[PDB]
Amino acid sequence: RKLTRALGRGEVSSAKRLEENRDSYTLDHIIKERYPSFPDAIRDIDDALNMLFLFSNLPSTNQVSSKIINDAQKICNQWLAYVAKERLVRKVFVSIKGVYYQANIKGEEVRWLVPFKFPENIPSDVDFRIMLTFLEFYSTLLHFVLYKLYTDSGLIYPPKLDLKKDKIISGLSSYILESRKYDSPVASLFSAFVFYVSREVPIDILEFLILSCGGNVISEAAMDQISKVTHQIVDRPVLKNKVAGRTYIQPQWIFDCINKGELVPANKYLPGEALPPHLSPW
Amino acid sequence: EYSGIIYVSRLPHGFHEKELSKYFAQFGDLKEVRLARNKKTGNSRHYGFLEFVNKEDAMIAQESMNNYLLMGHLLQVRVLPKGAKIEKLYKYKKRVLVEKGITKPVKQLKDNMKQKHEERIKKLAKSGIEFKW
Amino acid sequence: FVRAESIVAKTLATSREKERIKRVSILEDKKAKNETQHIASGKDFILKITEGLIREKTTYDGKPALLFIVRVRGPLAVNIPNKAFKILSLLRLVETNTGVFVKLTKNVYPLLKVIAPYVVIGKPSLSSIRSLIQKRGRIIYKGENEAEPHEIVLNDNNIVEEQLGDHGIICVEDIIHEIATMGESFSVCNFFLQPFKLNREVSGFGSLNRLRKIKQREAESRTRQFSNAATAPVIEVDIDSLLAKLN
Amino acid sequence: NDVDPIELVVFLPALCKKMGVPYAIVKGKARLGTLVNQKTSAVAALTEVRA
Amino acid sequence: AIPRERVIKAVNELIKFTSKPDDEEELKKDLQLIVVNNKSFTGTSKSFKLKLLNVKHSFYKPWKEASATAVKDFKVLLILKDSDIKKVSEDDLFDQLDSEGIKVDEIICGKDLKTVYKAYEARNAFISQFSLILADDSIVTSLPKLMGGKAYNKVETTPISIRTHANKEFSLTTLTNNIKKVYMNQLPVKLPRGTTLNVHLGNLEWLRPEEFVDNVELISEQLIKAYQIRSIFIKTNRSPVLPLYYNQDVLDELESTFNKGLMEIANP
RNA sequence: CCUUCUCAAACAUGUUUGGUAGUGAGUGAUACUCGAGUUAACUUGAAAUUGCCUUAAA
């Protein structure tokens, strides 16, 4: 009301001062009241993860703003980078709806879904105000939970990002996690392996999975802006000349290796051959 | 008495025939719209005439726009009395220059300019001037 | 009702725009002949404006470049003249909040000078290119049993292969690579894509949104400048931050 | 024009005519208040202006 | 070029005609040079840029010297860029032109012209009092719209473009040096769209007749190389003309990127 | 109820080339080039009676 009065009287600098001198509400006390135990919060963060990963992939509309979308994308990238560094993923399943990831977070199973990188159509038939209220609550919850996880692991929160790497690829790789033996075999798979990912293969998904079961990733798609390679992930009908000393694989080999825990042999995953069925881990 | 003819003066720089017709059509149907312009350049003379079909509409337009302050110009609107129709206001344009040809040959023009120089000399001698050649 | 001040102001602004475009056209014709003595300047300048704000004027190297062009709302009280409207229609930029990709070359520079007041020009980074194609990608697709084509989101790589397969374009990432690298079938990919329909950074008419509109207009006035000097350098802004706001 | 009690301004036009001062009656003491950073203003005056 | 004895006699004869025994006693003693060309000076295009002809003999300092007993004194106006108006103060010109005795009376810019002197009456009143108007060459091309079309009808109110920038930066030394060179050596001439070129040599009380002869000799010898001149005259106001040059041989001369861009931006 | 070409290269802080098309009306003298173009200086409130693209949206 007071800002409307200042604009109605024509006092623009007064209006600017009024907008500057205000304090917004916070939800920290509500989060602490509703989740007295950190394991309770960790058990409840799954719906929050689903809502955040959904809302980060939407385009900006009149109801949904680019600031909210960018905050969702940033918090999701921080979560993914934490999981990748601590090497905590356990299960991965690629369905037509998207990618399901299952991780172990403080001894509890956390399952969530990440959609594919496509321009999904907004229906304009859902209560976006209700969804945005849920998103605000979930953002506060995940900020608190990520702060506790980074601090208990001994990492700075929030992590600073590399600006040029951000402008090259906007993923979890932008955020460098700084300080001040993992659990075999899922974490230790792909040890001392260098994967060259082809352009058509999903770079975000494959980079996240290889980092989670830590190994080097060389992205061809990130070579647009402008030796040590062991494996190369590809999906094409006709494949060009192949270097003899390098192993050519299909992306389902990564997912099947993660799901099985052991090293599924690479003779079943070649471009000139058909793939076995992709079984659900559950 | 009064006719349906309107004299408008102190018109701003951008007010021209199309603008005047567009504005005063909202007051009524217009029989003829003319704006005084310079003959040698396409520049308005800041006055013009309009004619309404309805003399009542002419009177209303005058009593509405007579002292309208517009872009630093206080407009002036008058209703013309009976008779005195408007004429001779052609939409002039910004003229250009072109070099015309010469039918006088080189020798003829040299003779003409020599005669002109001689007349200049004779005029100087007439006017009490002691100068060589 | 139509007010006399609005009519006359529109006339004056349109006349100024016609004079600007006429001078640009005459100078570029003298450049096209390239055998004219009397000339203000015979080369091309780019003014890069970044952020309290720094402007650097450099000479255009002539090498081809990748530009992102956003159609913004033009000067106050201006009717768009015929040549500018024709160029914008060819660039498929008839309405604001719409972006396209352009291959900047020597024959493209004069058109950019002509359409300087209606568009904002930048150099998009690879991250913003990927974000635009992954977030706002739309094609018009005609089925066998569909009599009339319609616009759909660029969602299927099978359509990409069956519509652009002869040139070797297989998927969305291939389209992104061709757009970024400006290789063969660049215009084919560009016109297979529809122009990107962005959304406004400020929307609504509450008190907060009106204050945001005031700040946005102040920033736009501070950055964007029309020299009206027939030799104004082509202005290049931070399209990364602009696309962060508009996408 | 809308001043109450009206005697605060009812002598002003005759005074301005007697002293040879240009004046105008305007609608809105609240409008004059926006002019001089107040809620209302019975009067406003310009004395010195820039070139 | 010019016969020195003939031009000496011409100037002496005019200066004898000037004194046989309002503006009547003052306007009639201004000496004028008429240059007639075979062809048009500029061509089909109007020009407002004054042609600066160098002379050895100073001209504007005699104007200020002789204008102490006149109604309107000699005044110099300087117009610079708006961003550069903050780099110059009056003492900065005073201490750099006090040795030459040059005083700049008033410095304005584009913003001042567009705000303080916008109205026609104020603009004409402010312009009419100045005799020498010097402008930055960057800003000089925006001047016909600002100073108006009346100011270009006379030579003295037509602005003079001078170089103010060194190494793509503002330079007080360069600005003052150009001002000094203009004040001492060069004179402004109005190139016409006809054949009749007028030069205002000055006033008979400003300089000696020998100095007028030397200045007209240098101007004529320079203009010979400048264009293929045809006729040269010297006169005084309200008085006829005297020829001083003639030649014949120069009379013998009397008798798509836009579409490529459209193609590049269009699909087929 | 808009808001005005605010600059370039070349040679060695200097030198040369190019870049400027205007409110309207009126007074007027005087010369120059084939009804065409130039040529001293004077008046004036921005003065005036007729020269055949839409979120700058309701």
PDB file of C-alpha atoms in Angstrom, chain E residues 60-61 64 73-80 84-85 88-109 126 129-136 160 162 164 170 172 175-183:
ATOM      1  CA  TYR E  60      41.681  38.821 -36.222  1.00  0.00           C
ATOM      2  CA  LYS E  61      43.939  40.651 -33.763  1.00  0.00           C
ATOM      3  CA  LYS E  64      39.845  43.332 -31.732  1.00  0.00           C
ATOM      4  CA  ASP E  73      33.139  44.339 -30.040  1.00  0.00           C
ATOM      5  CA  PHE E  74      34.994  41.339 -31.424  1.00  0.00           C
ATOM      6  CA  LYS E  75      33.959  38.165 -29.587  1.00  0.00           C
ATOM      7  CA  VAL E  76      35.127  34.557 -29.827  1.00  0.00           C
ATOM      8  CA  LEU E  77      32.783  31.661 -29.048  1.00  0.00           C
ATOM      9  CA  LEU E  78      34.068  28.109 -28.568  1.00  0.00           C
ATOM     10  CA  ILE E  79      31.836  25.026 -28.836  1.00  0.00           C
ATOM     11  CA  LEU E  80      33.172  21.689 -27.600  1.00  0.00           C
ATOM     12  CA  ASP E  84      34.843  17.570 -22.856  1.00  0.00           C
ATOM     13  CA  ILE E  85      33.218  20.708 -21.423  1.00  0.00           C
ATOM     14  CA  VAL E  88      38.243  23.127 -19.668  1.00  0.00           C
ATOM     15  CA  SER E  89      37.947  26.107 -17.332  1.00  0.00           C
ATOM     16  CA  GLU E  90      38.369  29.789 -18.150  1.00  0.00           C
ATOM     17  CA  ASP E  91      41.718  30.071 -16.363  1.00  0.00           C
ATOM     18  CA  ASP E  92      42.967  27.045 -18.328  1.00  0.00           C
ATOM     19  CA  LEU E  93      42.445  29.102 -21.478  1.00  0.00           C
ATOM     20  CA  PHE E  94      43.629  32.324 -19.828  1.00  0.00           C
ATOM     21  CA  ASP E  95      47.059  31.009 -18.866  1.00  0.00           C
ATOM     22  CA  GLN E  96      47.516  29.304 -22.265  1.00  0.00           C
ATOM     23  CA  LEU E  97      46.467  32.265 -24.452  1.00  0.00           C
ATOM     24  CA  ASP E  98      47.511  35.230 -22.287  1.00  0.00           C
ATOM     25  CA  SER E  99      50.818  35.531 -24.161  1.00  0.00           C
ATOM     26  CA  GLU E 100      48.995  35.745 -27.508  1.00  0.00           C
ATOM     27  CA  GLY E 101      46.446  38.157 -26.041  1.00  0.00           C
ATOM     28  CA  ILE E 102      43.591  35.850 -27.070  1.00  0.00           C
ATOM     29  CA  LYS E 103      40.539  35.793 -24.796  1.00  0.00           C
ATOM     30  CA  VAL E 104      37.701  33.285 -25.171  1.00  0.00           C
ATOM     31  CA  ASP E 105      34.568  35.066 -24.013  1.00  0.00           C
ATOM     32  CA  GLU E 106      32.162  32.126 -23.671  1.00  0.00           C
ATOM     33  CA  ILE E 107      32.350  28.331 -23.982  1.00  0.00           C
ATOM     34  CA  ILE E 108      29.175  26.313 -24.605  1.00  0.00           C
ATOM     35  CA  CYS E 109      28.366  22.778 -25.742  1.00  0.00           C
ATOM     36  CA  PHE E 126      23.203  34.733 -28.214  1.00  0.00           C
ATOM     37  CA  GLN E 129      26.984  38.995 -30.494  1.00  0.00           C
ATOM     38  CA  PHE E 130      29.868  36.682 -31.437  1.00  0.00           C
ATOM     39  CA  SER E 131      32.185  37.325 -34.379  1.00  0.00           C
ATOM     40  CA  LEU E 132      34.384  34.193 -34.481  1.00  0.00           C
ATOM     41  CA  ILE E 133      32.795  30.811 -33.705  1.00  0.00           C
ATOM     42  CA  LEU E 134      35.198  27.872 -33.354  1.00  0.00           C
ATOM     43  CA  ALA E 135      33.876  24.326 -33.040  1.00  0.00           C
ATOM     44  CA  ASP E 136      35.231  20.866 -32.365  1.00  0.00           C
ATOM     45  CA  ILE E 160      35.015  26.855 -37.707  1.00  0.00           C
ATOM     46  CA  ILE E 162      39.329  22.846 -35.387  1.00  0.00           C
ATOM     47  CA  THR E 164      40.972  19.116 -30.552  1.00  0.00           C
ATOM     48  CA  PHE E 170      41.510  15.256 -25.534  1.00  0.00           C
ATOM     49  CA  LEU E 172      44.485  21.145 -24.257  1.00  0.00           C
ATOM     50  CA  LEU E 175      43.107  22.761 -28.887  1.00  0.00           C
ATOM     51  CA  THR E 176      45.006  25.939 -27.984  1.00  0.00           C
ATOM     52  CA  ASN E 177      47.533  25.405 -30.796  1.00  0.00           C
ATOM     53  CA  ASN E 178      44.749  25.084 -33.370  1.00  0.00           C
ATOM     54  CA  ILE E 179      43.044  28.184 -31.952  1.00  0.00           C
ATOM     55  CA  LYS E 180      46.318  30.120 -32.225  1.00  0.00           C
ATOM     56  CA  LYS E 181      46.859  28.989 -35.827  1.00  0.00           C
ATOM     57  CA  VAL E 182      43.319  30.017 -36.794  1.00  0.00           C
ATOM     58  CA  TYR E 183      43.639  33.379 -35.028  1.00  0.00           C
TER      59      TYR E 183
END
